[PDB]
Each structure stands twice: as structure tokens, then as C-alpha cells.
Amino acid sequence: PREPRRIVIHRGSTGLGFNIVGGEGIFISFILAGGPADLSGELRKGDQILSVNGVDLRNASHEQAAIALKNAGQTVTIIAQYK
């Protein structure tokens, strides 16, 4: 697989612009066109979020991940495993 990749998402108006689903892992389920996660063209639906702002999310429940993303602030550093 492609090596895990570090991405910085800059939050803007009203959201980070992506949804998540998911030990089973946290996966991108939706990327909003024109939104903060669409701008760099890096993340895609199906990618696994391995970390947010230094916090390992490989074992996170959906709730734990959603908390971590909602509290990561305006600058969100993600390590993603491309599908």
C-alpha cells in the first residue's frame, strides 16, 4: 500500500467538509466538493484516518474520532492511509 501520508486540513466556514464511518477503523465516507478536504485533492472516500493532531485513531470508535475531529480546531493534521 502507499505509505501513510500526513495531511493538514484548514477548517473554514461551518466544517472540515468530510464525513466518517466505522478496531475496525475510521474511514472517509464523504468529501464535500469545494470544501476544506476537497481543496488539496489528497483525501478520498474510503481512505482510513489513522491519526488526528497526534492522537492515534486506529482503535477509535466513531464517537471518539468525531470528538477528536470536532476539537482539533481550525488546523487539523491527519495521517491517512490511502485505500
* Residues in CB range of 56: below 8 A, 6 or more apart: 50
Alpha-carbon gap, residue 80 to 48, rounded angstroms: 6
Elucidation technique? X-ray
Contact yes or no for 39/81 (Cβ under 8 A): no
The x, y and z cell numbers of residue 44, run together, are 478520498
Alpha-carbon gap, residue 67 to 82, rounded angstroms: 22
* Residues in CB range of 78: below 8 A, 6 or more apart: 6, 7, 8, 9, 43, 49, 50, 51, 52
The x, y and z cell numbers of residue 22, run together, are 466505522
The angstrom resolution of this structure is 1.6
Alpha-carbon gap, residue 19 to 40, rounded angstroms: 16
Contact yes or no for 36/13 (Cβ under 8 A): no
